Paper text:
Therefore, we generated a Uba4C202K mutation to convert the labile thioester intermediate into a non‐hydrolysable iso‐peptide bond between the activated C‐terminus of Urm1 and the ε‐amino group of the introduced lysine. The covalently linked Uba4C202K–Urm1 complex formed well‐diffracting crystals resulting in a structure at 3.15 Å resolution, and its atomic model was refined to R/Rfree values of 21.1%/26.2%. The structure revealed two Urm1 molecules with slightly higher B‐factors bound to a dimer of the Uba4 AD, while no specific density could be attributed to the RHD, which although present in our crystals, appears to be mobile at this specific reaction step. In contrast to Uba4 alone, the Uba4–Urm1 dimer is fully symmetric and the AD interface falls on a twofold crystallographic axis. Interestingly, the C‐terminal GG‐motif of Urm1 is positioned in the same groove that was occupied by the linker region in the unbound Uba4 structure. Importantly, a helical region localized adjacent to the ATP‐binding site (aa 72–88) in the structure of apo Uba4 becomes disordered and flexible in the structure of the Uba4–Urm1 complex. In contrast, the loop containing Cys202, known as “crossover loop” in other E1 enzymes, becomes structured in the Uba4–Urm1 complex and an electron density can be clearly assigned to the covalent peptide bond between the introduced Lys202 and the C‐terminal glycine (Gly111) of Urm1. Hence, the crossover loop acts as a clamp toward the C‐terminus of Urm1, which appears to remain virtually identically bound to the AD throughout all reaction steps, including adenylation, thioester formation, and possibly thiocarboxylation. Therefore, the Uba4C202K‐Urm1 structure represents a unique previously uncharacterized reaction step, mimicking the thioester formation after the release of AMP that can serve as a model for this reaction intermediate in all other E1‐UBL and SCP systems.
In eukaryotes, the ubiquitin‐related modifier 1 (Urm1) pathway is responsible for the synthesis of 2‐thiolated wobble uridine (U34). Uba4 is a two‐domain protein containing an adenylation domain (AD) and a rhodanese‐like domain (RHD), which are both essential for the dual function of Uba4 in sulfur transfer and ubiquitin‐like conjugation (Furukawa et al, 2000; Huang et al, 2008; Schmitz et al, 2008; Leidel et al, 2009; Noma et al, 2009). Uba4 activates the C‐terminus of Urm1 via an ATP‐dependent adenylation step, receives mobilized sulfur from the Nfs1/Tum1‐relay system by its RHD, and subsequently forms thiocarboxylated Urm1 (Urm1‐COSH; Leidel et al, 2009; Noma et al, 2009). We heterologously expressed and purified Uba4 from Chaetomium thermophilum (CtUba4), a thermophilic fungus harboring highly stable proteins, well‐suited for X‐ray crystallography and other in vitro approaches (Bock et al, 2014).
Author numbering:
A (entry chain D), B (entry chain D): 4 to 71, 87 to 236, 238 to 304
C (entry chain G), D (entry chain G): 11 to 62, 64 to 111
The structure:
Amino acid sequence: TQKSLSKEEIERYSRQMIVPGMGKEGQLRLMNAKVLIIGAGGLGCPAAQYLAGAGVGTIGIVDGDSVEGMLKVDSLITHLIEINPLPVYVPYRFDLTPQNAAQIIKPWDVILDCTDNPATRYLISDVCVLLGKPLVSAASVQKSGQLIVLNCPPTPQGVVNKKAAPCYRCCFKKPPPPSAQTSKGEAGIMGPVVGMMGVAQAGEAIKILVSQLHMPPKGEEVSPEKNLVQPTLLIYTYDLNSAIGPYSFRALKMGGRKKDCFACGENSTLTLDGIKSGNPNYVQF
Amino acid sequence: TQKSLSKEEIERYSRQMIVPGMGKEGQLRLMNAKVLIIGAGGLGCPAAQYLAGAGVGTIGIVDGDSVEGMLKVDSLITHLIEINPLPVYVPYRFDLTPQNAAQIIKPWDVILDCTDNPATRYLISDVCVLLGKPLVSAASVQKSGQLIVLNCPPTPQGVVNKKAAPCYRCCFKKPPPPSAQTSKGEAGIMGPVVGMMGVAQAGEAIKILVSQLHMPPKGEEVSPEKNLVQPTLLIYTYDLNSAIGPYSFRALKMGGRKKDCFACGENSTLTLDGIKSGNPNYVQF
Amino acid sequence: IPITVDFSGGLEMLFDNQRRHSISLPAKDTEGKPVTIAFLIDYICKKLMKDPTDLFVLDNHIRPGILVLINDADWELEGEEAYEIQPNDNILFVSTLHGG
Amino acid sequence: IPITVDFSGGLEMLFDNQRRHSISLPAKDTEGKPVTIAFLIDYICKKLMKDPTDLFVLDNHIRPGILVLINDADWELEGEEAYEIQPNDNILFVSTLHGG
Ligand SMILES: [Zn+2]
Ligand SMILES: [Zn+2]
């Protein structure tokens, strides 16, 4: 709702206010924006740091885990105020589940996924899809990382009749593999990988808000130079036995909603009521 | 010199200790390592953050500038202890010049460049070359950023007879353009760009140390799968009107030492004594 | 047919830290009809592998985990495991990442 | 000769936020001999430009600032401003970044 800029705010944001695309007009977008981050460790931290810094209006965070007593949500928020006092930080000081995940998302304009568990990753997309929200998902384990921008702009469930942004299921159809799953606790993590990926995640979120890419298009089709409906899956491999290689960042363009997707496709048996009840039980492992 | 790992250290580093390439062996490399960052604003912060976190032995920082009273060096170091108490942080609480730059580098194993001024950027390479040190240079203005790994492994000045890593002059031969120069203060900066670039810079530095790539090779040639002697110049353009695009990360392989380079090439009239005196006066503008 | 094969996403670990793989194939399969990508999976897993099978292919089919791309194009629309390989094609095997 | 031309490194700002540029060229220059890259600079700066000249080319030559790459290959070894352009070549104009 805020229409004008504080001398306080004008001073803080002037460095990125004077860039093509980001006027008093472009900045107010971010200040009224409401972004949510699911997961506070690893990808959460840098993602949150670069939203905070950018002056995203409200920044949510969801993690019931503690540090290695004190929840990691709290630790991080305490950190973020130092970067930017002005944003409203909103800690969900527990872990997301089917019972709540519906409740935890309906408020927020853009969803970031840093969840680190495959079951949860599927859950979010489902909900995000149903509620009609854009997902910037991102993953990192060991020496490798990857990122993608799903359901932007958010196309209603089952509307296959129009060129329409792919869901996480549409992409990554049925896998997760049961015994091929490594965790960040299991397999470790190099710092710059999770860092690159988080920072980029924030990058995509900011973009979505500032250029208003979650806004459905004018019977007109959506420009393909946005890479929204046909979005790249950027894969970062970190080779600590080599310098930056031509095959360091590979960009795999992806298909629009799979007409037969379980969730966002034609004849989906997926209901918000469903997930709550335990309907698509996330027993895929 | 340290041969063994504290329970303190073993606890902190276990997450990246269990990754291919990074044993008790690979980690001790970083702990005895001495890295220097020239420039504390913008690219300095994230670069320093991900070295600190990684447990780089000693981390130097050089910036005479204050915040927007209190020097930005001090501000940042204060920040870094929070991330990792164990490293020795070393603030050069002034600005680098020809008179000192020689003095400020001779100690350090790896040099990071975040300097933001073209004259300075050339100065460092010159010195770095002469003293025989590897440079991870990186730059960012407005919506675009780029990074490269020069003089790794460090090949002595004038040794053109062997396949040899390119200097900053060898690359970017005579330009900087006098009136085409925009500063970060002049043209602004989006957050995720400088962030990506800094984090990557740390990335390259860590790699150099952990895999020991500053170490000259066995009469044997240097593997080209390191991309050291023929190193990529990664260019990141941030389009806030689009999602991650295939042309988001473009990787421009670069030429080994230009035999006729002013500085690191055959028949160079460049002397450490020279720069001190004001010899190649950095009046190129 | 000489082609380049790549790995990424914590798969290449299986193939001894190697991502880029160039090996020429026989133009014809075992039963004389042209090489399919059912072939490459079998050839690779049996010969090119440097590790224990469970992680790449199980029950005579690739693990649901991995994506396959032909010239950076979805494998599913272009042939989906029964694809006549081309004289200079690029095939990419990336294990979908579910950690963060 | 139809080729794709690209900008990056805070240059494309000059060409109205556009990076990718496809325009077919005459195979022969003004004096009848084959198109050189002295040509592309002249054609682009005069017609394709959307801004005031100082920033791209001055004194009948590109600003020292910029690098030119032909199929992601150094321009200097391959012809250096007097290069017979090829039927599907890619030429990249990137302004070297000296800020941070
Ligand atoms: Zn779907
Ligand atoms: Zn040189």
